[PDB]
Amino acid sequence: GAFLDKPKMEKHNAQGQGNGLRYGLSSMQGWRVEMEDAHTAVIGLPSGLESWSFFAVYDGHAGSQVAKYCCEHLLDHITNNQDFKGSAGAPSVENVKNGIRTGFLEIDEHMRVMSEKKHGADRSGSTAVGVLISPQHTYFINCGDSRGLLCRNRKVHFFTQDHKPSNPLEKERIQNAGGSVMIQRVNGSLAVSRALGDFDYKCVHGKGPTEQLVSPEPEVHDIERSEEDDQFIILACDGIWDVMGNEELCDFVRSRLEVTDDLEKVCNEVVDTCLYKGSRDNMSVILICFPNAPKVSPEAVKKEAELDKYLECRVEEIIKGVPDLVHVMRTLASENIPSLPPGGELASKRNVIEAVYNRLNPY
Ligand SMILES: [Mn+2]
Ligand SMILES: [Mn+2]
């Protein structure tokens, strides 16, 4: 219904280390009147999965109720059901894969009875994307238009495929549940074809839970882990992916990692870069790095210090009229400056340019 007059750019961070992993996250409200994103980051899991980890981004719609309940409870719905536990020993590929499906369906029904019982007024829904990381497998999980990727060996090794209504199997399901896809939207309103919650979209008679207008069924992919080649995993809501592609962001994160090992800082840079590339949505990013994540380079740090200083001089020189920040950005862009961060471009450097603009024209 509304945007803010000015963006809420305050970042919320977390970070941790364990099972050979390091992780950082950053969430920001941005231009939207509410923050309806949520996340989960836990290293070491209950009930004998000490050496497992779990990370997840939740993009909530029509309120944050569903997103928040998921962020605190999706994991135990996933690991504490007979499908995940099942077979006598350690959980197999199938156990894990079926366990997540059950987890997804059962928490959905759980939330439906809770809402029915307590007479809930919110009509919210949420995407989930994440990884369950075991000693030898990364299991990617997706439900909605949030997205995850694996950077392996300097390249995009795998990414999750967003559930858009106009996708062929999604459209088919929607049509069979008596709906249509109008442009990109389920009956002209809903932009996503899979989510937790959205219970009004889940009331077709004589169609299973996975056969409704909006499905809670996750897509799960088993990637075998690689001690030598596994570099980092990026999970983010569409607030990020709307304005940056797989290759770009993966190239950009690499560039940043070659400058800091501070993961919260890298995530802040993803989020600011995205706000400046024009994103007007809530943004949340998680960055999980593996032992062979890119390393800090003495040279890349110098190049960044050089580039920073260069951008400071241009600003000072561009001010002879006294142009506003917007106009300085325009001018700087039309200079076609070399060596800007890959993917990030000029946008990834606005905090540096702006801080300087302020040093010189503070009023
Ligand atoms: Mn949202
Ligand atoms: Mn969003």
UniProtKB/Swiss-Prot annotation:
Membrane topology according to the record: Lipid-anchor
One of the GO biological process terms: negative regulation of non-canonical NF-kappaB signal transduction
Lipidation, N-myristoyl glycine type: 1
Reaction catalyzed: O-phospho-L-seryl-[protein] + H2O = L-seryl-[protein] + phosphate; O-phospho-L-threonyl-[protein] + H2O = L-threonyl-[protein] + phosphate
Compartments (UniProt record): Nucleus; Cytoplasm, Cytosol; Membrane
Keywords: Cytoplasm, Hydrolase, Lipoprotein, Magnesium, Manganese, Membrane, Metal-binding, Myristate, Nucleus, Phosphoprotein, Protein phosphatase
GO molecular function: calmodulin-dependent protein phosphatase activity; magnesium ion binding; manganese ion binding; protein serine/threonine phosphatase activity; R-SMAD binding
Post-translational modification summary for this protein: N-myristoylation is essential for the recognition of its substrates for dephosphorylation.
Residues annotated as binding Mn(2+) 1: 59-60
Gene3D superfamilies for this protein: Phosphatase 2C, C-terminal domain suprefamily, PPM-type phosphatase domain
Necessary cofactors: Mg(2+); Mn(2+)
Quaternary structure, from the entry: Monomer. Interacts with SMAD2; the interaction dephosphorylates SMAD2 in its C-terminal SXS motif resulting in disruption of the SMAD2/SMAD4 complex, SMAD2 nuclear export and termination of the TGF-beta-mediated signaling. Interacts with SMAD2; the interaction dephosphorylates SMAD2 in its C-terminal SXS motif resulting in disruption of the SMAD2/SMAD4 complex, SMAD2 nuclear export and termination of the TGF-beta-mediated signaling. Interacts with the phosphorylated form of IKBKB/IKKB.
Protein role: Enzyme with a broad specificity. Negatively regulates TGF-beta signaling through dephosphorylating SMAD2 and SMAD3, resulting in their dissociation from SMAD4, nuclear export of the SMADs and termination of the TGF-beta-mediated signaling. Dephosphorylates PRKAA1 and PRKAA2. Plays an important role in the termination of TNF-alpha-mediated NF-kappa-B activation through dephosphorylating and inactivating IKBKB/IKKB.
The name this protein goes by in its record: Protein phosphatase 1A
Organism: Homo sapiens (Human)
